[PDB]
Amino acid sequence: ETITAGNEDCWSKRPGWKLPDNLLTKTEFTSVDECRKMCEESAVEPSCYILQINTETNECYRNNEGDVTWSSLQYDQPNVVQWHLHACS
């Protein structure tokens, strides 16, 4: 799945992807829209580009690394989904 608000920001989904907690920063958002909005707008480096959402609590986390350590990835995990920000046309 891939979505966009027609603003050059595209989001793609990765159900079941889970980075470990130490590679994430919990945000104040429990709305995916607001989390994605914050991510697209945050200018603070390390730049936000990966969100991970606890699907039973809706807590949204963002990558805390400038370059995500994907070697620590777990997939086919339950209750979690990631959203990936990609610049697009």
Coordinates of N, CA and C in Angstrom, one line a residue:
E1 N 0.8 -1.3 0.0 CA 0.0 0.0 0.0 C 0.8 1.3 0.0
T2 N 0.4 2.3 -0.8 CA 1.1 3.5 -0.9 C 0.2 4.7 -1.0
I3 N 0.4 5.7 -0.2 CA -0.5 6.8 -0.3 C 0.2 8.1 -0.4
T4 N -0.5 9.2 -0.8 CA 0.1 10.5 -0.8 C -1.0 11.6 -0.8
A5 N -0.6 12.7 -0.2 CA -1.5 13.9 -0.1 C -1.2 14.8 -1.3
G6 N -0.6 14.3 -2.3 CA -0.2 15.1 -3.5 C 0.8 16.3 -3.2
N7 N 1.6 16.1 -2.1 CA 2.5 17.2 -1.8 C 4.0 16.8 -2.0
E8 N 4.2 15.7 -2.8 CA 5.6 15.3 -3.0 C 6.1 14.3 -2.0
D9 N 5.2 14.0 -1.0 CA 5.5 13.0 0.1 C 4.7 11.8 -0.2
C10 N 5.3 10.6 -0.4 CA 4.6 9.4 -0.5 C 4.9 8.5 0.6
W11 N 3.9 7.7 1.0 CA 4.0 6.8 2.1 C 3.7 5.4 1.7
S12 N 4.7 4.5 2.1 CA 4.3 3.1 1.8 C 4.3 2.3 3.1
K13 N 3.5 1.3 3.1 CA 3.3 0.5 4.2 C 4.1 -0.8 4.3
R14 N 4.5 -1.2 5.5 CA 5.2 -2.5 5.7 C 4.5 -3.1 6.9
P15 N 3.5 -3.9 6.7 CA 2.8 -4.6 7.8 C 3.8 -5.6 8.4
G16 N 3.8 -5.7 9.8 CA 4.6 -6.7 10.4 C 6.1 -6.4 10.6
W17 N 6.5 -5.2 10.1 CA 7.9 -4.9 10.3 C 8.2 -4.2 11.6
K18 N 9.2 -4.7 12.3 CA 9.5 -4.2 13.6 C 11.0 -4.0 13.8
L19 N 11.4 -2.8 14.0 CA 12.7 -2.5 14.4 C 12.6 -2.6 15.9
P20 N 13.8 -2.8 16.6 CA 13.9 -2.9 18.0 C 13.7 -1.5 18.6
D21 N 13.1 -1.5 19.8 CA 12.8 -0.3 20.6 C 14.0 0.7 20.6
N22 N 15.2 0.2 20.7 CA 16.3 1.2 20.9 C 16.6 1.9 19.6
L23 N 16.0 1.5 18.5 CA 16.3 2.2 17.2 C 15.1 3.2 16.9
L24 N 14.2 3.3 17.9 CA 13.0 4.1 17.8 C 12.8 5.2 18.8
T25 N 12.1 6.2 18.5 CA 11.8 7.3 19.5 C 10.3 7.3 19.5
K26 N 9.7 7.0 20.6 CA 8.2 7.1 20.7 C 7.8 8.6 20.6
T27 N 6.7 8.8 19.8 CA 6.3 10.2 19.6 C 5.0 10.4 20.5
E28 N 4.5 11.6 20.5 CA 3.3 11.9 21.3 C 2.0 11.5 20.5
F29 N 2.2 11.2 19.2 CA 1.0 10.8 18.4 C 0.4 9.4 18.5
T30 N -0.9 9.4 18.5 CA -1.6 8.1 18.5 C -2.4 8.1 17.2
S31 N -2.4 9.1 16.4 CA -3.1 9.1 15.1 C -2.0 8.9 14.0
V32 N -2.2 7.9 13.2 CA -1.2 7.7 12.1 C -1.1 8.9 11.2
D33 N -2.2 9.6 11.0 CA -2.1 10.8 10.1 C -1.3 11.9 10.8
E34 N -1.5 12.1 12.1 CA -0.7 13.1 12.7 C 0.8 12.7 12.8
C35 N 1.0 11.4 13.0 CA 2.4 11.0 13.1 C 3.1 11.2 11.7
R36 N 2.4 10.7 10.6 CA 3.0 10.9 9.3 C 3.1 12.4 9.0
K37 N 2.2 13.2 9.5 CA 2.3 14.6 9.2 C 3.5 15.2 9.8
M38 N 3.7 14.8 11.1 CA 4.9 15.3 11.8 C 6.2 14.8 11.1
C39 N 6.2 13.6 10.7 CA 7.4 13.0 10.1 C 7.7 13.8 8.8
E40 N 6.7 14.1 8.0 CA 7.0 14.8 6.7 C 7.5 16.2 7.0
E41 N 7.0 16.8 8.1 CA 7.4 18.2 8.4 C 8.5 18.4 9.3
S42 N 8.9 17.4 10.1 CA 10.0 17.6 11.0 C 11.2 18.0 10.2
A43 N 12.0 18.9 10.7 CA 13.2 19.3 9.9 C 14.4 18.9 10.8
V44 N 14.1 18.5 12.0 CA 15.2 18.1 12.9 C 15.9 16.8 12.4
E45 N 17.3 16.9 12.2 CA 18.1 15.8 11.8 C 18.5 15.1 13.1
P46 N 18.5 13.7 13.2 CA 18.2 12.8 12.1 C 16.7 12.9 11.6
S47 N 16.6 13.1 10.3 CA 15.4 13.2 9.6 C 14.5 12.0 9.8
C48 N 13.2 12.2 10.0 CA 12.2 11.2 10.2 C 11.9 10.6 8.9
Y49 N 11.9 9.2 8.7 CA 11.5 8.7 7.5 C 10.9 7.3 7.6
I50 N 10.9 6.8 8.8 CA 10.3 5.5 9.1 C 9.5 5.6 10.3
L51 N 8.2 5.1 10.3 CA 7.4 5.2 11.5 C 7.0 3.8 11.8
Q52 N 6.9 3.5 13.1 CA 6.5 2.1 13.4 C 5.4 2.3 14.3
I53 N 4.3 1.6 14.1 CA 3.1 1.8 14.9 C 2.6 0.5 15.6
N54 N 2.4 0.7 16.9 CA 1.9 -0.5 17.7 C 0.4 -0.5 17.3
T55 N -0.1 -1.5 16.6 CA -1.4 -1.5 16.2 C -2.5 -1.8 17.2
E56 N -2.2 -2.1 18.4 CA -3.2 -2.2 19.4 C -3.3 -1.0 20.2
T57 N -2.2 -0.3 20.3 CA -2.3 0.9 21.2 C -2.2 2.2 20.3
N58 N -1.9 2.0 19.0 CA -1.8 3.2 18.1 C -0.6 4.1 18.4
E59 N 0.3 3.6 19.3 CA 1.4 4.5 19.7 C 2.3 4.4 18.4
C60 N 2.8 5.6 18.1 CA 3.6 5.8 16.9 C 5.0 6.1 17.2
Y61 N 6.0 5.3 16.6 CA 7.4 5.6 16.9 C 8.1 6.0 15.6
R62 N 9.1 6.8 15.6 CA 9.9 7.2 14.5 C 11.4 6.7 14.6
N63 N 12.1 6.6 13.5 CA 13.4 6.1 13.6 C 14.3 7.1 14.4
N64 N 15.2 6.7 15.2 CA 16.0 7.6 15.9 C 17.4 7.7 15.2
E65 N 17.6 6.9 14.2 CA 18.9 7.0 13.5 C 18.8 7.8 12.2
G66 N 19.8 8.5 11.7 CA 19.8 9.1 10.5 C 19.7 8.0 9.4
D67 N 20.4 6.8 9.6 CA 20.4 5.7 8.6 C 19.9 4.5 9.4
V68 N 18.7 4.0 9.2 CA 18.2 2.9 9.9 C 18.9 1.6 9.8
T69 N 19.3 1.0 11.0 CA 20.0 -0.2 11.0 C 19.0 -1.4 10.7
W70 N 18.8 -1.6 9.4 CA 17.9 -2.6 9.0 C 18.4 -4.0 9.3
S71 N 19.6 -4.1 9.6 CA 20.1 -5.5 9.9 C 19.4 -5.9 11.2
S72 N 18.8 -5.0 12.0 CA 18.1 -5.4 13.2 C 16.6 -5.6 13.0
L73 N 16.2 -5.6 11.8 CA 14.8 -5.8 11.5 C 14.2 -7.2 11.7
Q74 N 12.9 -7.1 12.2 CA 12.2 -8.4 12.4 C 11.0 -8.2 11.6
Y75 N 10.5 -9.2 10.9 CA 9.3 -9.0 10.1 C 8.3 -10.1 10.4
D76 N 7.1 -10.0 9.8 CA 6.1 -11.0 10.1 C 5.8 -10.9 11.6
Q77 N 5.9 -9.7 12.1 CA 5.7 -9.6 13.5 C 4.2 -9.1 13.7
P78 N 3.6 -9.5 14.8 CA 2.2 -9.2 15.1 C 2.0 -7.8 15.7
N79 N 0.8 -7.2 15.5 CA 0.5 -5.9 16.1 C 1.4 -4.8 15.8
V80 N 2.0 -4.8 14.6 CA 2.9 -3.7 14.3 C 2.8 -3.4 12.8
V81 N 3.0 -2.1 12.4 CA 3.1 -1.8 11.0 C 4.0 -0.7 10.9
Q82 N 4.7 -0.6 9.7 CA 5.6 0.5 9.5 C 5.1 1.3 8.4
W83 N 5.4 2.6 8.4 CA 5.0 3.5 7.3 C 6.3 4.1 6.9
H84 N 6.6 4.1 5.6 CA 7.9 4.7 5.1 C 7.7 5.9 4.2
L85 N 8.3 7.0 4.6 CA 8.2 8.2 3.8 C 9.2 8.2 2.7
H86 N 8.7 8.5 1.5 CA 9.6 8.5 0.3 C 9.2 9.8 -0.5
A87 N 10.2 10.6 -0.9 CA 10.0 11.8 -1.6 C 9.4 11.3 -3.0
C88 N 8.4 11.9 -3.5 CA 7.8 11.4 -4.8 C 7.3 12.6 -5.6
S89 N 6.8 12.3 -6.8 CA 6.3 13.3 -7.8 C 4.8 13.5 -7.7

